[PDB]
Design a protein around this ligand. Structure first.
Ligand SMILES: CN(C)S(=O)(=O)c1cn[nH]c1
Length: 164
């Protein structure tokens, strides 16, 4: 049973205009089986639009490609992103009053490198408000997080979304 194709795609921006379907494929096949690989071109001139997409056979292969950034393709560092609101920070809601920093760190550190955890407290009383923000060093962490159907932290079913 195959993961949905949309979750196996990487949009690659910043291409060299000399990158082709074939040279994009030869590069990104280092991290998995590619079922599709296309450079976007002008319909009349055939000149590259400077971006394209690759489709891997599995999500773990997408992860491997993202973990191998930075990618220099045909002499140019490109910008891969999963199938964009590119942010490094998430809102985590539903954590109630008993969730602490280490609960959030232990869970979210497996999505990416954490730089800030902010457990929100009431301005007047100091009581925990039941939500938090986590800032990572890179957007792919957030992209992986928000496509999951579920997040369970400290026994709580959490609401997680991109923040600003
Ligand atoms: C470079 N990466 C492996 S990452 O920092 O995005 C990461 C850390 N844990 N999961 C992903």
């Amino acid at each position: 049973p195959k993961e949905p194709e949309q979750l196996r795609k990487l949009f690659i921006g910043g291409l060299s205009f000399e990158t082709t379907d074939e040279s994009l494929r030869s590069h990104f096949e280092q991290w998995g089986t590619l079922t599709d690989c296309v450079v976007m071109r002008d319909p009349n001139t055939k000149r590259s639009r400077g971006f394209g997409f690759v489709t891997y056979a599995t999500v773990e292969e997408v992860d491997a490609a993202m973990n191998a950034r930075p990618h220099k393709v045909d002499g140019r560092v490109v910008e891969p992103k999963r199938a964009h609101l590119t942010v490094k920070k998430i809102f985590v809601g539903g954590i109630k009053e008993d969730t602490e920093e280490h609960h959030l760190r232990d869970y979210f550190e497996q999505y990416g490198k954490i730089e800030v955890i902010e457990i929100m407290t009431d301005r007047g009383s100091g009581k925990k408000r039941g939500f938090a923000f986590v800032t990572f060093d890179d957007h792919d962490s957030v992209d992986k997080i928000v496509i999951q159907k579920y997040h369970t932290v400290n026994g709580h079913n959490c609401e997680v979304r991109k923040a600003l």
